[PDB]
């Protein structure tokens, strides 16, 4: 039979919705009482984006577009394509990284997503996986560069530290997405719902939580 999202998946998403929404509102207000405002904006956008994406996924878990006999909840790629770049930025600001380099990490990132999307809608397993590799290779490149701003002597010693910190956290976490993907969206061995929940779990770690980390860090440092 076909693997399609259910009330369950819906639930999960709906839950994520609320969280995102709150963070959005939270930061959304907070910002008006700071100096520094930018860092806030970044994360406001991020969560507002997600919130929206999840909101769509949730209300339409029934309107199924399918690759094979398994529904693909693509809205997430959109989210990701927009959010992921903003997440890297959240860290980039803690560094003195050069525009030229920024564009590279970002560009890499964007493709990482698209490849995923490409694979997500591919029939031939033969290609599906090729695409998968691609993205991983992008996540790779991308990650590599992010670390050059670690050892290569280029902001303040406080920042540098916080940066390193958050990065290792983001760096590791992210590799989970591709793993989960590979499993469901990619292989099929994973349910649409479970994938949703898993992805969902990740998102909340990757976005709201990370956000706080950053905001704090900034707020913290700024106080020095
Ligand atoms: C899950 C969602 C609802 C979480 C939202 C968390 C928001 C409300 C949190 C996370 C970061 C937090 C801020 C971190 C740093 C400061 C500077 C400090 O001098 C006063 C508190 C203040 C300004 C915090 C206000 C509350 C804050 C903005
Ligand atoms: C959707 C609901 C849950 C959102 C609730 C958002 C609340 C927690 C957010 C929105 C406005 C925010 C406050 C905005 C202004 C200030 C004064 C500042 O000097 C310290 C942070 C502080 C005190 C913020 C604390 C966190 C705060 C109260
Ligand atoms: C808010 C969303 C976040 C932080 C999403 C992160 C997503 C990734 C790191 C995805 C990576 C993928 C690959 C490296 C290979 C192919 C499939 C993907 C798209 C899921």
């Amino acid at each position: 039979m076909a693997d399609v999202e259910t009330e369950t998946g819906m639930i999960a998403q709906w839950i994520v919705f609320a969280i995102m929404a709150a963070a959005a509102i939270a930061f959304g207000v907070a910002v008006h009482f700071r100096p520094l405002k930018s860092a806030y904006y970044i994360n406001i956008a991020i969560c507002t984006i997600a919130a929206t994406a999840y909101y769509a996924m949730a209300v339409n878990y029934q309107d199924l577009t399918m690759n094979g006999e398994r529904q693909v909840v693509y809205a997430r790629y959109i989210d990701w394509v927009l959010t992921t770049p903003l997440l890297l930025l959240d860290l980039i600001v803690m560094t003195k990284m050069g525009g030229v380099m920024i564009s590279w990490v970002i560009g890499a990132d964007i493709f990482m997503i698209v490849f995923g999307i490409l694979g997500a809608f591919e029939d031939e397993h033969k290609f599906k996986w090729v695409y998968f590799i691609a993205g991983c290779v992008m996540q790779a490149v991308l990650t590599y560069g992010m670390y050059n701003a670690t050892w290569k002597d280029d902001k303040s010693p406080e920042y540098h530290s916080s940066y390193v910190s958050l990065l290792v956290f983001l760096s590791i976490l992210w590799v989970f997405y591709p793993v989960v993907w590979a499993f469901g969206s990619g292989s099929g061995v994973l349910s649409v719902d479970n994938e949703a929940i898993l992805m969902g779990i990740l998102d909340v770690l990757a976005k709201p939580l990370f956000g706080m980390g950053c905001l704090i860090a900034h707020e913290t440092i700024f106080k020095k």
Side-chain angles (χ1 to χ4, degrees), residues 19 22-24 26-27 30 34 40 208 211-212 215-216 219-220 223:
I19 298 185
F27 301 172
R34 316 310 304 158
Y40 273 87
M212 289 176 255
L215 287 178
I216 283 181
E219 288 286 339
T220 307
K223 208 186 65 183

